[PDB]
Design a protein around this ligand. Structure first.
Ligand SMILES: *[C@@H]1O[C@H](CO)[C@@H](O)[C@H](O)[C@H]1NC(C)=O
Ligand SMILES: *[C@@H]1O[C@H](CO)[C@@H](O)[C@H](O)[C@H]1NC(C)=O
Ligand SMILES: *[C@@H]1O[C@H](CO)[C@@H](O)[C@H](O)[C@H]1NC(C)=O
Ligand SMILES: *[C@@H]1O[C@H](CO)[C@@H](O)[C@H](O)[C@H]1NC(C)=O
Ligand SMILES: *[C@@H]1O[C@H](CO)[C@@H](O)[C@H](O)[C@H]1NC(C)=O
Ligand SMILES: *[C@@H]1O[C@H](CO)[C@@H](O)[C@H](O)[C@H]1NC(C)=O
Lengths: 170, 315, 315, 170, 315, 170
């Protein structure tokens, strides 16, 4: 990816996570839990489904026979047919390979963006109260129980509340 | 104590390609290149004619194989490999131009041209075209001298297309398989057939002599055809060696001609056909048949073009 | 106290499409698909000929409608719907190949072929081609027997293209509208016209008999044409039923043929024409006419392809 | 957008801003003012104008008549013409739709980059002296009047000068 | 004290283009549009025939220039600008269709058709086709009346293709350069040549009279040809003015015909040819020749398409 | 670039650096040294080489003569040939220009990503221990000799070790 998040600064993704596409993994007073993010997952899926809306259909472009399977058309005109049919098949084949290569590049770079997008808006929730690990983890100076974890994920978290004990724990 | 961000994965991954790399692994991915055929002609709620042994061009002149279709009416015309346009051996001229016309014709209504003859046999027939007994083409008349060697008389027959639509007119020229026979059927002397509309004008003379036997005729009957504009008039003058029409064809409407080896099925519906059957698929490409027709996906050379529907895959 | 970063917007937004989404709203956006026609032929400072009633092929043989163009000279040739190449009814052969040639010809210079005849009328004419009085084609001679039924004598006329450029040669074959008449004009006996260069060699025989009346002639005169290489020589032998040339055409230079219903305008300039007029546009695509010609934008099926010229739009 | 700035972490853009494309909005000792950035606006416009330079012209590719409007060309050759003309119109239409879809994707992702690019170089100007709000706002520990605001926008601002009172106001 | 991040550069930069900008400078960049020609035909380990003066169509009928190739065998056929298919002046009919066939033929095996004649000279020849002494085409027989003006007798010759592959059959029609001469060689009376398979049937009559002199013959011999299906039978009836075959051609296998001005070279190998020689290149595009053939890069109008192989360049 | 790093927040790149593509430049107790990063250089080169693998070859698409250089084919069929050959050359020429324009856009945006990717993972190594200059430089509160420099580049660096003196040197 161009955003260097998926198989980049994030060592890798978690084979457990059967709940969504991007998620949270916590370690606190209480022990551990791992839980899926609906918003980042839904944004990626909205945009992957949006590419398949574009492609999965067909344009009304219908064709009739200009040569004959059973009984070969005159040779002069037939060469031109074959060559024109060959030049068109050569061109649609480049066009499909390159559309899909471009769609695959942007599909990956897009998911890599939604990984980074979640990380950054979590980083902003904790303005002073925590500092970046670097393996895509946030180390919190203040202790953060399952109610405090559910508030970052539930996106109700109050930085104002824990800034007191966290900041002074420089 | 701490919180941690990341993404999902499974180690049952799928390979895709990009501008940058050949065979990146991802979460979910889909085929865009349909390669699953239906070995049927999916014909539901489309008026479908199966010519089988009938040649498509044969519907216009009416060999036995075609007697069920002299006035066929269809949105979907299925030409078959076994299907054969004639009985007394011969070709149609620009046969394929004429096929392309009929394939899109919606079928054909026959209308009487209203020729009738005097001082010629009209009833000339052939074991090549048997129905029950030596017969001939349905729509045609095989004009012969009254007696063996009798002199087929110079003659003209004219037909004005008074209809709003152009009339398909066919006629034949008879290559007797010996100049001996030519003269037995038509009388000696060079035989001439000239045909003309406002705009068309062509001469035809028979080239008697022995071709190979086919359905048991060393002779040959080549068909020629034109599309008579309305208020236009085809004139046939001829000397003999002329196979007259009896009926004009008028095209019915719109249809689609397909060449196919696949059986009918009025249970399924489908928009896209080829020699091997029907392509039903919403995928943007296909690798089944570059010669498929109907409403189809763009055919591509590639066996497979996997499109990413999930992020990069990291175990 | 604090500072704040962000971007602009208006809630008069414009919809565009992307790889990812159908109908994203953005700040500014532009049409790339020109659909605004000029219902004029924008002809400024291009030598422009309007054939109007003159048929393009008619400039080579010279029916009345075309007398103003027998030697026309133009960069831009406008063929009109009303325009008609002949007067005595008939067709040109590969007429459209010949049109494509003339459309790019830059016009035509006429040069004398220097035929003259003896023991034939040369002066044969027709109320079909009237100027003031029964006339004939400008560039052609209608060779007839001296007297009704008189025997038009076998004859040859030869013309060497001694010019650096290939000579356009036309000739006609005369389908008298009755074998009765054929023989009145040319004498009885089969009529033959053979024509040949180093490289070309064709026979033509008339097919007399009655076509439909057109400009009041049941007869027909079909034109045939070839392009005589320099130092090459066309030879015409003939028996009668032959319409001679009098002049060869030489192509002038480069031009462009357009078919159009739109009026001229030497006030505007423009590079791209179609049936309906001129496309002036810097846009890369157009949806006006897939059959447009000149220097044009790629025609596309889409009515509209909106390209983003501003960021996403958020109220 | 892939940079997750426009209609992302920035709640939204300001209908007032008739002055440029990206701007600054301040709240201080003095009250309020909202003012346009020339550099981020000019970079986006340079690159949008650059795409229209590529497209708005035409290649010299001129065509002549190979069929006849008034008087239909022979049927055999004519089918081949129609079918070749249809296959070319099918292909240019895909090529235009996809060029414009790719140009629209990159046009948006490019403006989204220039939003993010301004935010980051402002964040760097205030190295210690302020900490990120998360709605695309910088909360300054030190008070910052219209002269101090004009210096961040005028890009003359001295972090060294206010680091004293701001840093110790942890 | 501190650490600092950044990227490399040199001020010997290379310009490239993007969606966004015309002439961005970058570190390294490469040409994707091959414009370096090899002015040779790179023929290594490909069976290569250089027709030089031999016309490709000439291998089938055998003018002198072609005597080395009557049975040529090759994967790569080089047609030369100087190369000329005939000796007694004339054309082949659909010559180019026939060329396209032979260009891919793998060469031709000749097989005897096993005609022999009686009561005609068979030995007719011409200073146009000299080997050592007035000769004629290798594969052909020039049938003439036994004596000047003697009456060439009506005649038929038939040849069944009993081989698994279709037989290439050629025959000629002889335009004597005066009706005087026609009758000297063949006898007076109209001359007729009809030819027919199961499926083909055509008449030919000579059009005697004087063409321009070419290799010293005002007369002309036009060749006609068909491709005889196996178990099919070509029949030739004729009156005179007929140039018989003696041998059928059978295609050998697969090959490639190229038109070229470039010398051979069995030292180099190469997959892609044009008039000017061989394109060897792994680049995806080329601007050398839009008419090149073999396994080639897509030809593009652009002189240069520079692809970035390094980052933006900042001094 | 979309990542705004190359010819953006990084003033520019260093004409000295003949060792690799992205590198480090240090100023310490000892004086100065400038040294190349293998990982960021290798990732960019892996992906530039990957584009040339895609393009530098050819598809098996071979063509035969349908017209004649020496001796012009019939005019009716020949116009159709010319026009079909012209429409195909018009289309491959757009397809090449646009492939290369798209490949050039993504080639640049990709190198711009690998510039940014190195900067961010260096920023994370120094979690508390240094704060961003803004000209793509990290100002370290603690002094950092050539052994300390070699550890950030050698990517063995221990933030835990110098956090003590650096953090308190706020
Ligand atoms: C064109 O290719 C077809 C298969 O699509 C082959 O059977 C045929 O021989 C070729 N036709 C001509 C006229 O070259
Ligand atoms: C044909 O002729 C009739 C009268 O003979 C006329 O009224 C009609 O408009 C013409 N029809 C067409 C289709 O040209
Ligand atoms: C034609 O012939 C003349 C003499 O008759 C000769 O000098 C000239 O080069 C030839 N011109 C062309 C255009 O072939
Ligand atoms: C091709 O389509 C045209 C309109 O562009 C239509 O009028 C015509 O009938 C079609 N021509 C042939 C020869 O199929
Ligand atoms: C041709 O005929 C032979 C016998 O005359 C027959 O056995 C054979 O199958 C036929 N060959 C072909 C190639 O049709
Ligand atoms: C087509 O262009 C060629 C060059 O490729 C030119 O020499 C020729 O005159 C043109 N052919 C036809 C038949 O228009």
């Amino acid at each position: 990816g161009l955003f260097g998040a998926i198989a980049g600064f994030i060592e890798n993704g978690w084979e457990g996570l059967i709940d969504g596409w991007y998620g949270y993994r916590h370690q606190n007073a209480q022990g551990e839990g791992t839980a899926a993010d609906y918003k980042s997952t839904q944004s990626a899926i909205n945009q992957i489904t949006g590419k398949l809306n574009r492609l999965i259909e067909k344009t009304n472009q219908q064709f009739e026979l200009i040569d004959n399977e059973f009984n070969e058309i005159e040779k002069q005109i037939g060469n031109v047919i074959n060559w024109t049919r060959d030049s068109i098949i050569e061109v649609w084949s480049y066009n499909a390979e390159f559309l899909v290569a471009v769609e695959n590049q942007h599909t990956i770079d897009l998911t890599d963006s939604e990984m980074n997008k979640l990380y950054e808006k979590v980083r902003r929730q904790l303005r002073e109260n925590a500092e970046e690990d670097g393996n895509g983890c946030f180390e919190i100076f203040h202790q953060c129980d399952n109610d405090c974890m559910a508030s970052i994920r539930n996106n109700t978290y109050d930085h104002k509340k824990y800034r007191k004990e966290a900041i002074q724990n420089r | 104590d701490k919180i941690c961000l990341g993404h999902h994965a499974v180690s049952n991954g799928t390979k895709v390609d990009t501008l940058t790399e050949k065979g990146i692994e991802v979460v979910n991915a889909t085929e865009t290149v349909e390669q699953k055929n239906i070995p049927k002609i999916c014909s539901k709620g489309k008026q479908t004619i199966d010519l089988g042994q009938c040649g498509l061009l044969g519907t216009t002149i009416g060999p036995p194989q075609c007697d069920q279709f002299l006035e066929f009416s269809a949105n979907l015309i299925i030409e078959r490999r076994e299907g054969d346009d004639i009985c007394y051996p011969g070709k149609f001229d620009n046969e394929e131009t004429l096929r392309k016309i009929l394939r899109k014709s919606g079928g054909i209504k026959k209308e009487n041209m209203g020729f009738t003859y005097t001082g010629v046999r009209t009833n000339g027939e052939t074991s090549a075209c048997r129905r029950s007994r030596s017969s001939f083409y349905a729509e045609m008349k095989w004009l012969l001298s009254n007696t063996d060697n009798g002199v087929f008389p110079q003659m003209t027959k004219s037909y004005k297309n008074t209809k709003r639509e152009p009339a398909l007119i066919i006629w034949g020229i008879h290559h007797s398989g010996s100049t001996a026979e030519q003269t037995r059927l038509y009388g000696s002397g060079n035989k001439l057939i000239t045909v003309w509309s406002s705009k068309y004008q062509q001469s035809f003379a028979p080239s008697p002599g022995p071709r190979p036997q086919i359905n048991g005729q060393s002779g040959r009957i080549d068909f020629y055809w034109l599309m008579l504009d309305p208020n236009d008039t085809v004139t046939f003058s001829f000397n003999g060696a002329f196979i007259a029409p009896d009926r004009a064809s008028f095209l019915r409407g719109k249809s689609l001609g397909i060449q196919s080896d696949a059986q009918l099925d009025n249970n399924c519906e489908g928009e896209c056909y080829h020699i091997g059957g029907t392509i039903i698929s919403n995928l943007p490409f296909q690798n089944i048949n570059s010669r498929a027709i109907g409403k189809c996906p763009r055919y591509v050379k590639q066996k497979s073009l996997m499109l990413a529907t999930g992020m990069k895959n990291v175990p």
